[PDB]
Design a protein around this motif. Structure first.
Motif, mmCIF file in Angstrom:
data_model
loop_
_atom_site.group_PDB
_atom_site.id
_atom_site.type_symbol
_atom_site.label_atom_id
_atom_site.label_comp_id
_atom_site.label_asym_id
_atom_site.label_seq_id
_atom_site.Cartn_x
_atom_site.Cartn_y
_atom_site.Cartn_z
ATOM 1 N N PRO B 116 0.818 -1.215 0.000
ATOM 2 C CA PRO B 116 0.000 0.000 0.000
ATOM 3 C C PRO B 116 0.849 1.260 0.000
ATOM 4 N N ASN B 117 0.330 2.288 -0.667
ATOM 5 C CA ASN B 117 0.938 3.608 -0.646
ATOM 6 C C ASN B 117 -0.163 4.651 -0.756
ATOM 7 N N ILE B 118 0.108 5.830 -0.211
ATOM 8 C CA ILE B 118 -0.903 6.873 -0.080
ATOM 9 C C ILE B 118 -1.036 7.607 -1.408
ATOM 10 N N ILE B 119 -2.218 7.522 -2.017
ATOM 11 C CA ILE B 119 -2.469 8.233 -3.266
ATOM 12 C C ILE B 119 -2.887 9.670 -2.988
ATOM 13 N N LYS B 120 -3.959 9.846 -2.221
ATOM 14 C CA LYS B 120 -4.394 11.172 -1.797
ATOM 15 C C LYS B 120 -4.291 11.264 -0.281
ATOM 16 N N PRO B 121 -3.505 12.188 0.260
ATOM 17 C CA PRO B 121 -3.412 12.315 1.714
ATOM 18 C C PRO B 121 -4.528 13.173 2.287
ATOM 19 N N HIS B 122 -4.938 12.823 3.502
ATOM 20 C CA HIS B 122 -5.862 13.663 4.251
ATOM 21 C C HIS B 122 -5.134 14.898 4.766
ATOM 22 N N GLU B 123 -5.739 16.069 4.567
ATOM 23 C CA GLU B 123 -5.090 17.317 4.949
ATOM 24 C C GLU B 123 -5.147 17.584 6.446
ATOM 25 N N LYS B 124 -6.008 16.883 7.182
ATOM 26 C CA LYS B 124 -6.181 17.112 8.612
ATOM 27 C C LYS B 124 -5.951 15.835 9.412
ATOM 28 N N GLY B 125 -5.030 14.985 8.958
ATOM 29 C CA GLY B 125 -4.780 13.729 9.633
ATOM 30 C C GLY B 125 -3.354 13.262 9.441
ATOM 31 N N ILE B 126 -3.021 12.195 10.159
ATOM 32 C CA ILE B 126 -1.716 11.549 10.077
ATOM 33 C C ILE B 126 -1.879 10.356 9.143
ATOM 34 N N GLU B 195 -18.999 27.260 6.487
ATOM 35 C CA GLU B 195 -18.536 27.928 5.278
ATOM 36 C C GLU B 195 -19.441 27.574 4.105
ATOM 37 N N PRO B 196 -19.987 28.562 3.398
ATOM 38 C CA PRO B 196 -20.765 28.259 2.193
ATOM 39 C C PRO B 196 -19.897 27.608 1.128
ATOM 40 N N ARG B 197 -20.476 26.643 0.418
ATOM 41 C CA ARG B 197 -19.780 25.924 -0.636
ATOM 42 C C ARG B 197 -20.642 25.887 -1.889
ATOM 43 N N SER B 198 -19.978 25.874 -3.039
ATOM 44 C CA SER B 198 -20.674 25.828 -4.312
ATOM 45 C C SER B 198 -21.133 24.407 -4.621
ATOM 46 N N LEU B 199 -22.042 24.299 -5.585
ATOM 47 C CA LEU B 199 -22.566 23.004 -5.997
ATOM 48 C C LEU B 199 -21.624 22.377 -7.017
ATOM 49 N N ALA B 200 -21.145 21.175 -6.720
ATOM 50 C CA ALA B 200 -20.276 20.436 -7.620
ATOM 51 C C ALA B 200 -21.085 19.423 -8.424
ATOM 52 N N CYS B 201 -20.461 18.901 -9.479
ATOM 53 C CA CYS B 201 -21.158 18.034 -10.419
ATOM 54 C C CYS B 201 -21.257 16.586 -9.958
ATOM 55 N N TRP B 202 -20.542 16.192 -8.901
ATOM 56 C CA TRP B 202 -20.515 14.779 -8.535
ATOM 57 C C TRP B 202 -21.845 14.312 -7.959
ATOM 58 N N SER B 322 -12.454 0.503 -3.687
ATOM 59 C CA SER B 322 -12.962 1.298 -4.796
ATOM 60 C C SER B 322 -12.058 1.112 -6.004
ATOM 61 N N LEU B 323 -12.597 1.450 -7.174
ATOM 62 C CA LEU B 323 -11.832 1.469 -8.410
ATOM 63 C C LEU B 323 -11.694 2.862 -9.002
ATOM 64 N N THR B 324 -12.252 3.884 -8.357
ATOM 65 C CA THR B 324 -12.200 5.242 -8.876
ATOM 66 C C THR B 324 -10.959 5.952 -8.351
ATOM 67 N N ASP B 325 -10.237 6.600 -9.252
ATOM 68 C CA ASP B 325 -9.068 7.373 -8.859
ATOM 69 C C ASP B 325 -9.508 8.629 -8.116
ATOM 70 N N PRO B 326 -8.994 8.879 -6.909
ATOM 71 C CA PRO B 326 -9.408 10.076 -6.163
ATOM 72 C C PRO B 326 -8.858 11.374 -6.725
ATOM 73 N N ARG B 327 -7.897 11.320 -7.642
ATOM 74 C CA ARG B 327 -7.283 12.525 -8.179
ATOM 75 C C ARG B 327 -8.060 13.127 -9.342
ATOM 76 N N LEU B 328 -9.115 12.460 -9.813
ATOM 77 C CA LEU B 328 -9.961 13.054 -10.842
ATOM 78 C C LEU B 328 -10.816 14.178 -10.269
ATOM 79 N N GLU B 329 -11.418 13.954 -9.103
ATOM 80 C CA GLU B 329 -12.206 14.963 -8.396
ATOM 81 C C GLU B 329 -11.729 15.030 -6.953
#
Lengths: 613, 512, 80, 51
Positions: B116-126, B195-202, B322-329
């Protein structure tokens, strides 16, 4: 293709598919909106809508009570509780005139009810503020605690069995200077002021009163129910089927004498700050007018609940919670520390609440003389609204326009007829100002007007003579958890009642029955004897399966099939199958000498066992 | 009955002004006669107190103003459209299999594990803690075969990475106010406005995939009594036509996933109160050929679950295949740390293809009131059915006949159901049923006070627009107030924002 | 607090039912398959004995039979 | 255990052909004990590999 359910309204009219606009049809898992800050905001809002009233310190209380009625007439469309006594009494007089003798008769039935009223009936209620532990407890225990403490004092007449003597015992506690409590585990003393304040607090849980007032409020609610049962405009306290006809009745009544040149407009209206503007002192005036030419005792009994609601208080929740980023702490402040405290520990928003509320703090309870709380005098407020609606007859408006409609506790629908659009506007304005005179405020943002034919009233969407028939509260398709015999009967009774009360659809009822039967079979491991699912009972249930010749007489708990449908839900399962059970099966199942039973309608079988404790 | 003492003096102050005694007021009321004060006080009342009606035209309504900000992120408790299953078949002798050994059987069917290796890291975690937690999950599933007796449930070792992941050490201490009066930074909970957030397409894609059909049956309902009455015939026809079309929908799979996972969580919380129990994410279905299929979606590690009330929170860590790459969205996965754990081998029509297989890991918290909400998701069927049934009875009243046959059997797809580059598309009655089920399921999953408020406040706008479409001369008193009431509920929730966008689309298409 | 979850949990137990002490002289401890029908364990505060749900089905398929002729008429409203 | 769970025709055992040089009640009790000890497996907190 991007799916969009709302586009269904391009073809289907909204009233037909209105059920798709309700997200939950149940009870959402957050139940938020309550707390100390919300209570403080509620009290501040109540005292802000009546700023131009008269302040007076109460002798027996010591808190500044505000009396806003008979104050200056409002200058704008903002909420205002500046009601007028003369207007309220005139509305009551006209209501009694249009329905001659209603008050007298209603007094007779109220006296009939009040004669044999039992104290034990007070156990039936929601959470009650126990005045002994200063906390919320079920009414079944609050009544016991209060009667036992009264027994410990010279207040042991409430064992007479009639609720009138219990209320007399409550009365006598007012003129005793020391209330003593001996908890069998300590000695506690409450003086005049402490007991009086504890007897007049509305505790948060929407709030809840104490136990010394539920008896008093019950009689005024009974009287208001008697009044409303004779009133056609009221939408209370009828059920579903007898209430769906009221919309059609009021629509037809306003569209018969009307010709094709007289305009008719209906408003689906909502009332803003219903409980923060109506005043108990006006309810006192209405009670006095209702019970005129009546015995002094009966009038005295019904006249005290408005007095207490005029001299009531609201408890300030449980308090607030702090945090620290250095010492890692979560220390709290209770409500009693909001009188003397440092205001820097709170944020900007809460500081204004504390500054506004601080003059009204008395022993941790804010003084709330004007206004009400959620759902206490719903029937009386309905009576007042119906009285205001009654002024719309042509013999009272004396103009070309005239109005009538339905009024529930806080929801109303109003149809006004006038020859021209300007007459419609004038009638709407006159109704608005008449409601303003009596402390009733109509929510402009939440209300709209259109031509007669489609409207809404208490989630009843009327469109061209049709009212949508769907259940806003779906049943629980789960086992009650009593035993095998009770659970089946309770589930089928729940489904039948929900069909005959909430107008649950037949297909939805059938699917609910399917889900309930699945849950029942999985909970009690009573799958059919011909099934392939293997449990600990599956062997025994199969030995009973092949042994039985007539397999359609076996109970579901015995691996038998489900014979329930829409037409059978009123028949108990044992009775429903007592023509296909084998003789030996009948003898075994209903043997009086079975070891499982010992000496909502179910026959006593071996499935009526007692679970472990 | 008499009143004396406290209430005699107290009643005198519970009266309208210009009154001194309760008896005086009581005597005054007995002689009251209506002299016409209402008309006079109406004459005195200012003209600014009115109820002016502003007309509602076809140019008056405006679109809802959605908030601006960074795009919204997923907040569901399990992966919806990105979920991956490890499935095993089951004949009939596996009747009641322990969920732990079913998970082991499902994992034994995969041989593509990597380092295993970290593809997308959590910004608020270890993130190394998440990596070590996955490694510990993999290792503790192989020690099971090395025990003298096979355990029914697996409790994980309370390692440092699990302690950090489950929040076992950041719980501060409940101390009285008297002992911490003089603290320089002791304030109340920072209630910073979301915090207000915009509507995303996902989220729209999630809803689109939720209404589609799968290759498996997810509900198998029990039998009912024989139909005799004509109303029973109508009800059975409606129910059978509804069930035969909704049983294969992906929303039904979401319902089953929620029910199973919340039931397992509640059972583990009630039983293993002190253990870091491992809970497989298991769902059961029937294949097209009638074979039982067990699906493993991932694992949940539960923290300490000493629950006294229904609001006490259990913390847990969810790892999902999962099979979806987290770096697409990447903005959708703000609260996740995504690892690369294997290489799945998909056998498509053009041959075998190797695709990376990821693990989505995040820390979540639930409660007894939330778990019971998830256990009873089958109500979403009962709701959806009555939404279809009520659409029939309402439409079958103007014809005074029964329109059940004219809806399901009529093969003319005549219900506008979505947008398209060309325009508004239309679907049949079955697609409408599945869309309504998906809407109910998403209302259950993304349940919030904002959704409740938005639905309640936009019901009125829908009714006003309908009255306009009926030429009923709609009239408002404060339309801007209603719009501000609606727009107050649109802050950061993707589901509520999607519903507001749907309302905007309906509003722009209805006035044409 | 919720009776349904309690019932579901307690049905997974081995002897969730309470019966009279005399049951041990009416039904065998184990059935044809070796499954134990009751356990020699008293109630928490009474003289009742722990009993499996299998014992109810055993009684319904193998217990003594009596006369049930007046049962159809005693619940007159329900059978009507 | 899985193979035995597929059979539901179990009956009250009785001796058909007795052994001429044995205590047949012991054989009956041995079969009963075999049947009983296969149902106690579910009553163990951990499942054993061998019985």
């Amino acid at each position: 293709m991007d799916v969009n359910p709302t586009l269904l309204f391009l073809k289907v009219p909204v009233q037909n598919a209105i059920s798709t606009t309700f997200p939950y049809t149940g009870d959402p898992p957050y139940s938020h909106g309550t707390g100390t800050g919300y209570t403080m905001d509620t009290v501040n809002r109540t005292h802000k809508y009546s700023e131009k009233g008269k302040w007076t310190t109460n002798t027996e209380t010591g808190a500044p009570q505000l009396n806003p009625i008979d104050g200056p007439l409002p200058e704008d469309n903002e909420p205002s509780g500046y009601a007028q006594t003369d207007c309220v009494l005139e509305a009551m007089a006209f209501l009694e005139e249009s329905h001659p003798g209603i008050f007298e008769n209603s007094c007779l039935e109220t006296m009939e009810i009040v004669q044999q009223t039992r104290v034990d009936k007070l156990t039936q209620g929601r959470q009650t503020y126990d005045w002994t532990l200063n906390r919320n407890q079920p009414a079944a225990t609050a009544l016991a605690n209060t009667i036992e403490v009264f027994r410990s004092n010279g207040l042991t007449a409430n064992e007479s069995g009639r609720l009138i003597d219990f209320l007399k015992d409550v009365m006598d506690s007012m003129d005793k200077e020391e209330m003593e409590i001996t908890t069998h585990f300590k000695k506690q003393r409450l003086n005049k002021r402490s007991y009086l304040i504890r007897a007049l607090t509305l505790n948060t849980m929407i709030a809840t009163p104490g136990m010394q007032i539920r008896g008093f409020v019950y009689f005024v609610e009974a009287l208001a129910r008697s009044i409303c049962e004779k009133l056609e405009q009221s939408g209370l306290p009828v059920g579903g089927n007898e209430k769906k006809a009221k919309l059609a009745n009021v629509v037809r009544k306003m569209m018969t004498n009307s010709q094709d040149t007289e305009l008719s407009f209906t408003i689906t209206g909502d009332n803003t700050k219903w409980n923060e503007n109506q005043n108990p002192r006006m309810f006192l005036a209405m009670i006095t007018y209702i019970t005129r030419n009546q015995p002094e005792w009966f009038r005295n009994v019904l006249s005290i609940a408005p007095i207490m609601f005029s001299n009531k208080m609201a408890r300030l929740g449980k308090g607030y919670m702090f945090e620290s980023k250095s010492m890692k702490l979560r220390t709290q402040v209770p409500a009693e520390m909001l009188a003397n405290i440092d205001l820097k520990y709170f944020n900007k928003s809460t500081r204004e609440k504390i500054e506004k509320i601080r003059p009204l703090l008395i022993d941790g309870t804010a003084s709330l003389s004007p206004g009400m709380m959620m759902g206490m005098f719903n029937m009386l407020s309905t009576v007042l609204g119906v009285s205001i609606l009654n002024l719309g007859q042509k013999k009272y408006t004396k103009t070309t326009y005239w109005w009538d409609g339905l009024q529930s506790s806080d929801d109303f629908a109003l149809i006004v007829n006038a020859p021209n659009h300007e007459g419609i506007q004038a009638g709407v304005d006159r109704f608005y100002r008449t409601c303003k005179l009596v402390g009733i405020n109509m929510s402009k943002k939440k209300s709209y007007i259109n031509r007669t034919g489609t409207f809404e009233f208490t989630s009843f969407f009327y469109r061209y003579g049709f009212v949508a028939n769907f259940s806003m509260e779906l049943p629980s398709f789960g086992v009650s958890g009593i035993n095998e015999s009770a659970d089946m009967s309770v589930g089928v009774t729940v489904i039948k009642n929900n069909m005959i009360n909430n107008d649950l659809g037949p297909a939805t009822a059938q699917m609910a029955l399917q889900l309930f039967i699945k849950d029942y079979r999985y909970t009690y491991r009573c799958h059919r004897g011909d099934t392939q699912i293997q449990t600990r009972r599956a062997f025994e249930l199969k030995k009973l399966w092949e042994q039985t010749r007539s397999k359609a007489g076996l109970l579901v708990s015995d691996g038998g099939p489900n014979l329930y449908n829409i037409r059978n839900l009123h028949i108990p399962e044992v009775c429903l199958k007592w023509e296909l059970m084998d003789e030996d099966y009948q003898g075994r199942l209903c043997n009086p000498m079975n070891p499982f039973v010992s000496h909502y309608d179910a026959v006593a079988t071996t499935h009526s066992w007692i679970p472990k404790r | 009955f008499e009143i004396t003492g406290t209430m005699r003096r107290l009643a005198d102050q519970s009266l309208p002004p210009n009154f001194s005694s309760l008896e005086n007021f009581r005597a005054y009321v007995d002689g009251f006669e209506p002299n016409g004060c209402i008309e006079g006080k109406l004459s005195q009342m200012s003209k600014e107190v009115n109820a002016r009606i502003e007309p509602f035209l076809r140019t008056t309504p405006r679109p809802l103003r959605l908030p601006d900000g960074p795009p919204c992120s997923q907040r569901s408790k399990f992966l919806l459209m990105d979920a991956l299953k490890l499935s095993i078949e089951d004949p009939s002798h596996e009747g009641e299999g322990i969920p732990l050994y079913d998970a082991i059987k499902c994992m034994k069917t995969f041989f593509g594990w990597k380092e295993p290796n970290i593809i997308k890291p959590h910004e608020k975690g270890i993130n190394p803690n998440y990596l070590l937690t996955w490694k510990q999950v993999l290792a503790e599933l192989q020690d099971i075969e090395n025990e003298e007796k096979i355990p029914r449930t697996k409790n994980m070792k309370k390692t440092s990475q699990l302690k950090w992941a489950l929040g076992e050490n950041m719980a501060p201490e409940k101390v009285d106010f008297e002992d911490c009066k003089d603290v320089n930074d002791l304030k109340q909970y920072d209630s910073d406005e979301p915090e207000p957030r915009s509507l995303a397409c996902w989220i729209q894609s999630e809803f689109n995939k939720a209404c589609e059909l799968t290759d498996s049956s997810w509900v198998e309902l029990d039998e009912i009594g024989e139909d005799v009455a004509p109303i029973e015939h109508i009800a059975s026809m409606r129910r059978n036509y509804f069930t035969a079309e909704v049983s294969h929908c992906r929303a039904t799979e979401y319902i089953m996933k929620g029910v199973y996972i919340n039931t397992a969580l509640l059972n583990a919380s009630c039983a293993a109160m002190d253990d870091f129990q491992l809970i497989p994410m298991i769902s059961k279905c029937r294949t097209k050929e009638g074979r039982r299929k067990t699906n493993l979606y991932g694992f949940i590690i539960k923290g300490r679950s000493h629950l006294r009330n229904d609001t006490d929170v259990v913390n847990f860590v969810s790892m999902e295949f999962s099979l979806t790459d987290p770096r697409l969205e990447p903005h959708k996965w703000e609260k996740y740390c995504v690892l690369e754990i294997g290489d799945m081998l998909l056998r498509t029509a053009v041959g075998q293809v190797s695709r990376p297989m990821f693990l989505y890991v995040r820390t979540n918290g639930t409660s007894k009131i939330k778990m019971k909400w998830g256990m009873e998701m089958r109500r979403c069927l009962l709701q959806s059915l009555q939404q279809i049934e009520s659409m029939i009875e309402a439409e079958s009243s103007v014809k005074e006949k029964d329109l059940t046959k004219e809806f399901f059997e009529n093969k003319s797809e005549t219900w506008p159901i979505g947008e398209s580059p060309k325009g508004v598309e239309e679907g049949s009655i079955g697609k409408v049923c599945r869309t309504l089920l998906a809407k109910s399921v998403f209302n259950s999953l993304y349940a919030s006070p904002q959704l409740e408020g938005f639905s309640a406040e936009s019901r009125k706008l829908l009714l006003i627009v309908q009255a306009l479409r009926d030429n009923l001369e709609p009239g408002t008193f404060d339309l801007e107030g209603l719009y501000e009431a609606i727009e107050e509920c649109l802050i950061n929730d993707p589901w509520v924002l999607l519903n507001a966008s749907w309302f905007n689309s309906f509003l722009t298409h209805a006035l044409r | 607090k919720n009776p349904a979850l309690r019932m579901k949990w307690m049905m997974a137990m081995k002897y969730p039912i309470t019966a009279d002490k005399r049951i041990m002289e009416m039904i065998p401890e184990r059935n044809e398959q070796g499954q134990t029908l009751w356990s020699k364990t008293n109630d928490a505060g009474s003289d009742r004995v722990m009993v499996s749900p299998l014992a109810v089905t055993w009684w319904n398929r193998n217990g003594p039979t009596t006369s049930t002729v007046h049962y159809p008429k005693v619940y007159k409203t329900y059978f009507e």
